[PDB]
Amino acid sequence: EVILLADLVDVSKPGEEVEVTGIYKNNYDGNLNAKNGFPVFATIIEANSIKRREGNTANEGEEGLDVFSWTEEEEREFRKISRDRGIIDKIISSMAPSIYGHRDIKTAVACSLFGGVPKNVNGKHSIRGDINVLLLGDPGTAKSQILKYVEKTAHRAVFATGQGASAVGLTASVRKDPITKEWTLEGGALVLADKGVCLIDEFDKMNDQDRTSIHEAMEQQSISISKAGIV
Amino acid sequence: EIPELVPVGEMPRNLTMTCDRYLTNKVIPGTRVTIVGIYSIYNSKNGVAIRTPYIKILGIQSDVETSSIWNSVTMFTEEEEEEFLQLSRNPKLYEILTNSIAPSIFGNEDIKKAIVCLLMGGSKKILPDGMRLRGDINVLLLGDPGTAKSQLLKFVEKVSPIAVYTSGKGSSAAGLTASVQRDPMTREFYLEGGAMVLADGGVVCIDEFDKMRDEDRVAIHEAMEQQTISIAKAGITTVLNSRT
Amino acid sequence: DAVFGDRVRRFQEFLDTFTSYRDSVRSIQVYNSNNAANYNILPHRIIISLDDLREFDRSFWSGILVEPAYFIPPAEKALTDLADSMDDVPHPNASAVSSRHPWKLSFKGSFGAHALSPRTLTAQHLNKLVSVEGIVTKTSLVRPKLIRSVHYAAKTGRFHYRDYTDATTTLTTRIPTPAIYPTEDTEGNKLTTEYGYSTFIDHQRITVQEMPEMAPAGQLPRSIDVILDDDLVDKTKPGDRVNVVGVFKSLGAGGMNQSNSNTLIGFKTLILGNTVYPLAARQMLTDFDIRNINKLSKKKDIFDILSQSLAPSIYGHDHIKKAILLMLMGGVEKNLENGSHLRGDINILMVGDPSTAKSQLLRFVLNTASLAIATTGRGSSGVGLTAAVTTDRETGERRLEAGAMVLADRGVVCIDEFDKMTDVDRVAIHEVMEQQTVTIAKAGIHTTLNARCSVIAAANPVFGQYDVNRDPHQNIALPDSLLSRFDLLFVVTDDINEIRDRSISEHVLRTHRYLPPGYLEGEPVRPKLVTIPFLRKYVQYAKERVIPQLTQEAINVIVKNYTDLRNDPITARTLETLIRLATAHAKVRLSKTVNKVDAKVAANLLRFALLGE
Amino acid sequence: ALPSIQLPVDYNNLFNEITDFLVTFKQDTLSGPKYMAMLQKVANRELNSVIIDLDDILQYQNEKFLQGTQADDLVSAIQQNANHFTELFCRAIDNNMPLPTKEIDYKDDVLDVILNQRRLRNERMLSDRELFPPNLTRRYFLYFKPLSQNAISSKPLSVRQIKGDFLGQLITVRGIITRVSDVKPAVEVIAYTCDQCGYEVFQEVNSRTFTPLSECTSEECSQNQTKGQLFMSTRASKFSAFQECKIQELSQQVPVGHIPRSLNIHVNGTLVRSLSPGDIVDVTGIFLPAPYTGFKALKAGLLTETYLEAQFVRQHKDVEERVMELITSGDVYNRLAKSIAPEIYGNLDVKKALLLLLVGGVDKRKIRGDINVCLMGDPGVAKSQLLKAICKISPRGVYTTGKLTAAVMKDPVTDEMILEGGALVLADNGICCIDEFDKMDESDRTAIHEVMEQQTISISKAGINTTLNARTSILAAANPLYGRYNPRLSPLDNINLPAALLSRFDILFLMLDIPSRDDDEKLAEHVTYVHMHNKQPDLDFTPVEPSKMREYIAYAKTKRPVMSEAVNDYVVQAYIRLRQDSKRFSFGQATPRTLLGIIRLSQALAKLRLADMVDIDDVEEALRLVRVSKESLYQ
Amino acid sequence: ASFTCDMCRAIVDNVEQSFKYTEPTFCPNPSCENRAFWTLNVTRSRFLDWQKVRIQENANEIPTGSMPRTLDVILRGDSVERAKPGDRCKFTGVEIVVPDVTQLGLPGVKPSLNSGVTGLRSLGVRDLTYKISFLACHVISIGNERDQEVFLNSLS
């Protein structure tokens, strides 16, 4: 059990992988000594900080709590490189540098990774802002390495493939808690990509019920749930 | 909390609140409400120093919700009633209501007329022999993608005073109709209403109706036609009214 | 007290003014004395009219209807004194002397604003006498409760009694007794408890839920818990549309203790039920109604009049409504000497096209029956139809609660969408159709439950529309074993027409043009035909009064028709089915014999049901 | 605090009436006081159960009325409060205890030696140079028997008709006992011994709970005020055989739309173990409440349970000369076939097979001796009526549905699961009638092989593995998946039964709903002829006698005949003939298991004719019945 | 364990807890008369690693139709995490017996089916139950470095 205090509340999410840097304390409880038979002390981690473990983080060069954060000099360099003519071609050619060719693939991935603008018209109409990209190709054309690069690159990135992705493994599900036996929602794969990228590998071989349960997230950008007394 | 204002990647958090005296029985579940009140702390029977928070309600306001629990009661103000009578005396209010539905959707004029007919609805009639006839109309938009059917569903959910928006994939037989749940403290079964109970007296909207399961489609037949859900489960038998 | 004695003499003056209550108390006492001491016992209760007490003393009427805790026990004391002064019995029993129940009050009359509903019972009506209406649910087990203990001391040889008070028993609040028997007397040394002279009353908790037709938009029905006094115990079964008159009272510390410093829980609220009214499932029969029934029974086409009197809004299905009429007045049941249970309850399965008004006939036989329970294909469970085992709150003991199919005993079950049960529910339903009793062997409980009930059910074919290809397998998706227990398999086809279609169209436009009486035009709703209460009185009269018996002039016709129908989906059970029609038509004629006109109508109806005529 | 009232019942005069009735009354209507003789038998240790009859008390007060004096209505005082009158009668018996007239056997009684040493203590301490509770010395258990044919105890009541006003009164209930617990000892006097003073103390128990004594309250132990620790002794304690069972309301007594209620019956003393589960009984007992102790009594308050302390239990339920009368009647096979289930017509051979199911076959020291029969017929030809009827003639048999099996269930009187017997358990040494053999569970589809083969119910649940006893003959009823029978449909394909089941199984009978005009008439006037008059019709034949079969089949089970060797040679030749027919559509061939079945049918008819040899014409008629089964396989 | 008195801040250290968490009774300051309310010193006290592994007999020595009997084995000190579940393994050490800790009157725990021993002052009127456990001191189980220098160092 990990204690979150002050700003650290609501930072972590259910299913989110984190690196907690915290003080490892111990306290006396009577239940462990009751059910164990030996003078055993419970252990409690008081968290001092939480770092999101985004991507593989095999690179140890990004030293900081948030890898996608910036300083003021980094913002100055962003404003410097944004005014260069041809920055679009630089971003496209720099997107997945380990893959040769495939200019349409890299352009579509850049468009999906940056995305458009969601629009609200008068509080009455909603326009989806994100861009969904399908890569149909022969095997041995490095379609999945681009997906792994987007996993490394995007701010939030969720992966799914094949029969291993259920209809409610995506979207969101409901479940009965062991305490009080109440029906509570559980966030799916698309809940963990609320401002990010969901990536599906081997899309055709996935079941139709599992393929196409994601219409409302990919069109209305929303998950409407009506089950077990929960709407 | 409001789904438009949820934080990124999280779940909407349920918060327990209380009303006293004449603030009680003012809201139907499913409405959108603005509430003013004090944020107090009460100790609960369920770690260290954890005292659960609540809000003691001092004031309830909701333009979408009217007349508290429904009694067919006229609480509209007199000058607004005169303005509404002026709208009913308009020679071309039909085109006004047609253009009011989906101003950002081109075409689909007959769909907009059917939507206005759905929102106004028919008249419920009672016969001396107990014959109850339907006073609502159910509209199914079947067609190609890119015809903005789901945008019409969302706008119907916005315009209607009592409305819920559901899925075909995200639905269930106990989810649309009323469900049988168990109370934790008493260990007794009780019926908690579903999506067609929260939409009683109003509009239920279903998206991707072609895809909802064959056991899931057919729990709706009495709720569409007979305007009731007859449930006999877990020792509880009842006929709830669902005028959706 | 002085004010207590003053209200005692005021209620004594009221009972002196109206001498009908004295006559009723005298009648109860002489009936008990004649049926108990000499060669089914009238209890200690009187029917107090609020209206008759209103013209006597409006202060006492307002005291009863506003603050009944200080007004009902003085009237109890005055009525007990009048019953003691009226009783003149020699040589009484010791248990009769020691254990006397005081004469309780049961209230009738108009209540005005106090006549309420379980949803609108609110905190301003606490400690007030209210009348509520709703469904009985979750009846607790009948369990005795001690209110007076009588002990004997042999060293002194004297009997000492101690009175025991509860929050639910007494309207006034007394200091609670911890229900410990006195081990020893202060002067009489050892004390021995003498059961039999001690006073025990039956205690029962019911739950009055709001009537679901009066539920508002978007809200579930609410419920209250009602204590039943020992006279009113077992008057109510679950599913009863009861009207309970009682004092809406709150009890308990309710979180005001020092342990519950900031818990926001409320107080536990109950109703101490003064009286219980059925609200007339078995309607009383005046002699004018009997004269009308026996006058119309002599007509030759009383079957036709009572058939088209059922649901005039529904056009067509005339033979189906005839079968519905013979279903409500189901045939006689015969129990043989060897123990074979021969079913007298005719059951009907209606399969066919959409919008042929099968579910509307289900709603009509729901409304017009004495006891009717509805169920749906996807809204039912097999355990939820027969019985479910659950704990009880006031006992801490496991017990059964009856499901849908058992609570409708001596009644009808209105099954809609029968073609799409889960197989688990199909097992239980088929078990009732072949056995009429359900055997529950679980939770340490080995019980059998009787269900002698009729079944009307509606179904669609396995296709979207019914085929005219007369395929036996595509009639229903259920197995033919469940088809066999249904006596009348009616099939309906919505064949597309012009003249009859125009007749149905004009009939339903005449149906929509009806305006209910006493209501304004254009506002929201808030050849002889007999009335439907008169039809229910006819059905009730035929059910309890006449038991027909079977006679040979129908029998030769029945065996000739069976040989014609079978030898030229037929079953031997069809023979019993003819009997389940034939004496049922005798229940139309009210005669105790069955004649040829019953058997010919039975053969015609079964030929319509099977061949289509 | 405790105010006092007056009641018009005198306990001293009633005690005088009881102690005069014990020495005065004698029953000369049957042809010295008989109750004094019973107390003499108590003093001679002949009997342990003393039954006071209220009819004897009513006749005694009627005799007092004949003498001219008047009693104090003793039987009404018994019926109002029997709990105090039980102890009053016990003290009246102890006041009039006769001297023993035989050998005492003083070495067996430890309490006599203890009370001898305590009287030595009392004479030594009070030399100066009650002692025991009365329930300790009581070796008799007192019971009450209600009056009959002479009044509330005489009238039998249902469980629902028992109200709160019937507490303290002797009542009578009719009901089926659901659960009977094991016989457990309940204490009445606890003996504690002091290790220092060497004395004892007795503490009486009249509740569900009791508290022990820590320190001795003896005069010698407290005079020097030594703090001796008391030790409980089970040797000198007074015990009673207590058993708690649950009685259920009969379904005829239950109103329409209600669930039957259960009541607790506690039996004590010599009335233990007479109660049996599944038995409809009349129980006359004292209706007493059961109070709690401590926190449960404080929280539940005035709301108190109840139980029944049973006083009397009544069961609701030459032979060879009648057997010889049935012999001289003639045609025992046809009479016992047509007499069984008189609501059906015809179908003689399958009805004879239903009889021979009840007859059964012989065993060998092991080969099973059970015959098993199936009705592999069309729907609507009265299957369940035959199953219910063949349950009603033969006792120790239950109707069951395959929608079946035995399993130990939880939520018992104890927290552990009790081995509640299923349908196969209670049908042991009898007949189990399984309806809808097509519609049955896969677990039962496993279980039927162990039922037929090893005749046991092997259940392993919650770490408990046990083998319950099911020595059961099986009737099966199996409709096919399609109702109609056609030669285009194979029999095994139509019935969809596995081949191993029919390989184990002996005799299938297929009757079909074939429309024949005269046959439908002869069935039709019979079916409506049970509907003409009251109950069973006239049989237009030798009439039925439902009581007569159950002893004749018991005698048939009693003979167990043994057959000769030349008849066995004819059986071998007939088996060779049926294997030659198996060389010759129904695939079903003759097996060695069918030969054992043929043998079972052979000694079944040897049992019916009460014969010592199996006759040759009996064997060929049995193989004719096998040919009838072959005709059923064809049609 | 080391504890401090809440009255006079006196220090009692080297309190040994056999099977339940125990506090000192007598304050070592003769001026102070404290008996209860002792505060634990988390930093000063010395702790050891604990692991409770549950074992059963192997399938070779299981007789016909028997559920396997179980035994709790305590690993302390260096021997923690040495034994992984599902392995044939040999523990050598001490057979010990453990009491019911709840029956000894542990602080903050209510007293909690076989009848055991009683008549103790810490028990009061309650009884004490015993379980067979094991205190193993050495474990064996009877059921990477991709560089040249460390591999030649690890080589014979």
Ligand SMILES: Nc1ncnc2c1ncn2[C@@H]1O[C@H](COP(=O)(O)OP(=O)(O)O)[C@@H](O)[C@H]1O
């Ligand atoms: N420019 C490139 N074009 C095609 N394949 C490449 C390129 N660069 C690397 N690869 C190879 O593609 C492989 C990954 O292919 P993958 O995406 O798994 O195939 P698929 O598209 O069938 O899933 C890698 O092992 C890598 O060696």
Ligand SMILES: Nc1ncnc2c1ncn2[C@@H]1O[C@H](COP(=O)(O)OP(=O)(O)O)[C@@H](O)[C@H]1O
């Ligand atoms: N007539 C239109 N006016 C404006 N937007 C439209 C129109 N037709 C289609 N669209 C756009 O195309 C999308 C169509 O989605 P929609 O057809 O509602 O999904 P579904 O196929 O699930 O019904 C919407 O997001 C909408 O913004």
Ligand SMILES: Nc1ncnc2c1ncn2[C@@H]1O[C@H](COP(=O)(O)OP(=O)(O)O)[C@@H](O)[C@H]1O
């Ligand atoms: N006179 C009539 N003739 C035919 N149909 C009618 C008539 N009156 C009402 N109906 C229709 O019958 C319908 C009810 O049948 P339905 O609900 O389809 O039964 P089920 O639910 O069993 O299929 C109603 O919608 C009503 O419009």
Ligand SMILES: Nc1ncnc2c1ncn2[C@@H]1O[C@H](COP(=O)(O)OP(=O)(O)O)[C@@H](O)[C@H]1O
């Ligand atoms: N003498 C008789 N001959 C044939 N059938 C009869 C006779 N008497 C009654 N029956 C009918 O047989 C039916 C029993 O059905 P049953 O054989 O149990 O059906 P299933 O074979 O589908 O289980 C009863 O409903 C009854 O109407």
Ligand SMILES: [Zn+2]
């Ligand atoms: Zn002593």
Ligand SMILES: [Zn+2]
């Ligand atoms: Zn100190």
